[PDB]
Design an enzyme around this catalytic site. Structure first.
Site, PDB file in Angstrom:
ATOM      1  N   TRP B  72     -15.707  -7.148 -21.727  1.00 50.69           N
ATOM      2  CA  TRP B  72     -14.760  -8.488 -20.838  1.00 50.69           C
ATOM      3  C   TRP B  72     -13.207  -8.711 -21.684  1.00 50.69           C
ATOM      4  O   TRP B  72     -13.646  -9.600 -22.367  1.00 50.69           O
ATOM      5  CB  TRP B  72     -15.622  -9.383 -20.064  1.00 50.69           C
ATOM      6  CG  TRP B  72     -15.990  -9.178 -19.495  1.00 50.69           C
ATOM      7  CD1 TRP B  72     -17.335  -9.600 -18.966  1.00 50.69           C
ATOM      8  CD2 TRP B  72     -15.808  -8.359 -17.728  1.00 50.69           C
ATOM      9  NE1 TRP B  72     -18.200  -8.721 -17.928  1.00 50.69           N
ATOM     10  CE2 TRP B  72     -16.888  -8.489 -17.127  1.00 50.69           C
ATOM     11  CE3 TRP B  72     -14.586  -8.365 -16.777  1.00 50.69           C
ATOM     12  CZ2 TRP B  72     -17.575  -8.833 -15.773  1.00 50.69           C
ATOM     13  CZ3 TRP B  72     -14.669  -7.884 -15.977  1.00 50.69           C
ATOM     14  CH2 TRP B  72     -16.075  -7.698 -15.231  1.00 50.69           C
ATOM     15  N   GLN B  88      -0.613  -8.679   1.311  1.00 49.37           N
ATOM     16  CA  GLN B  88      -1.714  -9.306   1.774  1.00 49.37           C
ATOM     17  C   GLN B  88      -1.437 -10.436   2.836  1.00 49.37           C
ATOM     18  O   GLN B  88      -2.136 -11.274   2.084  1.00 49.37           O
ATOM     19  CB  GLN B  88      -2.680  -8.439   1.287  1.00 49.37           C
ATOM     20  CG  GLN B  88      -3.481  -7.446   1.513  1.00 49.37           C
ATOM     21  CD  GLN B  88      -4.053  -6.580   2.164  1.00 49.37           C
ATOM     22  OE1 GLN B  88      -5.390  -5.834   2.141  1.00 49.37           O
ATOM     23  NE2 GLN B  88      -4.146  -6.914   3.356  1.00 49.37           N
ATOM     24  N   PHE B  89      -0.919 -10.090   3.717  1.00 45.75           N
ATOM     25  CA  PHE B  89      -0.956 -12.072   4.545  1.00 45.75           C
ATOM     26  C   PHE B  89      -2.501 -11.696   4.976  1.00 45.75           C
ATOM     27  O   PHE B  89      -2.333 -13.387   5.081  1.00 45.75           O
ATOM     28  CB  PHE B  89      -0.138 -11.765   5.540  1.00 45.75           C
ATOM     29  CG  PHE B  89      -0.289 -11.253   6.893  1.00 45.75           C
ATOM     30  CD1 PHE B  89      -0.811 -11.508   7.623  1.00 45.75           C
ATOM     31  CD2 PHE B  89       0.173  -9.988   6.625  1.00 45.75           C
ATOM     32  CE1 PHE B  89      -1.345 -10.450   9.022  1.00 45.75           C
ATOM     33  CE2 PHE B  89       0.105  -8.597   8.247  1.00 45.75           C
ATOM     34  CZ  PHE B  89      -0.686  -9.652   9.251  1.00 45.75           C
ATOM     35  N   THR B  90      -3.202 -11.318   4.991  1.00 46.30           N
ATOM     36  CA  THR B  90      -4.676 -11.089   5.349  1.00 46.30           C
ATOM     37  C   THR B  90      -5.298 -11.676   5.189  1.00 46.30           C
ATOM     38  O   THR B  90      -6.444 -12.855   5.658  1.00 46.30           O
ATOM     39  CB  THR B  90      -5.717  -9.447   6.289  1.00 46.30           C
ATOM     40  OG1 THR B  90      -5.644  -8.776   4.686  1.00 46.30           O
ATOM     41  CG2 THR B  90      -4.554  -8.802   7.039  1.00 46.30           C
TER      42      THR B  90
END
Lengths: 159, 161
Positions: B72, B88-90
């Site tokens: 990381w 991405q409205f979902t």
């Protein structure tokens, strides 16, 4: 628990070839779905079997496909489609402080495994043995996914 | 805002082309990245430019790669990698209701587009405009993603400060 569900036309899961490496890039296909869902599953330290059952219910019954013009109409089972379940401890990666994420909330790898595998058993019991593909728990993976839409859904049972 | 960040070796975004042949691909590639991130971005109805800034800062500054000898360690900018940003409205699909999801928490399409476009501009501002790729906002899309890990980070800015 947490899951990211994505609607696919296909996904192909691969792991690194044994022996080779760890400088060296070469992969073995070990899992493959056609149309269906890829479910990225994060198991939380305090997840009970209740959380698991909620996730499984939603993966199996969430209506994510059109029927003609009718949106959000068919679930994965209605269409005889496949699920590919992949363990994802990163869903619990705390990013609030700093740019180096840490994953303290995720269940411990060994307890995670038996919990995960129980989940895979139940998926198979609630649907079909033939439709549940899986990854290699704890192992690095390459997944070629054909995102369909895309349709990405996110569920956290601690809500 | 909500975002789903996924670490990728590559991503290839197509749309349905309209008037077609026998025998001839329905899909046409409009957008492409190699190594980097796909960021599926959800814009809430009550989102501010502060919500957007957070998302952008994280996408670009999150250290999601190993620099040999440290996990990381590095971000997209460090590695000179690419971001593919797709609305991405979902992500505001409410699923408690029944098995039919609803998305009433997502910003309306016309004002979401304006917001999305400002974000794409701010991405290009904060990094490089050569490294920011996008899809086709209100359009159906096929996206072939090579997930690397996989690594899937989730952030909802309505959780932070």
């Amino acid at each position: 628990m947490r899951v990211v569900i994505q609607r696919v036309k296909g996904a192909i899961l691969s792991v690194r070839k044994e022996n080779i490496g760890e400088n060296e890039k070469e992969l073995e296909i070990i899992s493959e779905i056609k149309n269906g869902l890829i479910c990225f599953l994060g198991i939380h330290k305090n997840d009970t079997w209740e959380d698991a059952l909620y996730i499984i219910r939603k993966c199996l019954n969430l209506r994510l496909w059109n029927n003609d013009n009718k949106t959000w109409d068919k679930n994965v089972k209605d269409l005889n489609y496949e699920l590919l379940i992949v363990s994802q401890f990163t869903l619990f990666g705390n990013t609030k402080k700093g740019n180096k994420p840490d994953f303290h909330l995720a269940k411990e790898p060994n307890e995670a495994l038996i919990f995960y595998n129980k989940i895979i058993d139940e998926f198979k019991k609630q649907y079909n043995d033939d439709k549940i593909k899986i990854g290699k728990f704890g192992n690095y993976m390459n997944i070629d996914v054909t995102n369909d839409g895309p349709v990405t859904i996110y569920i956290d049972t601690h809500d």
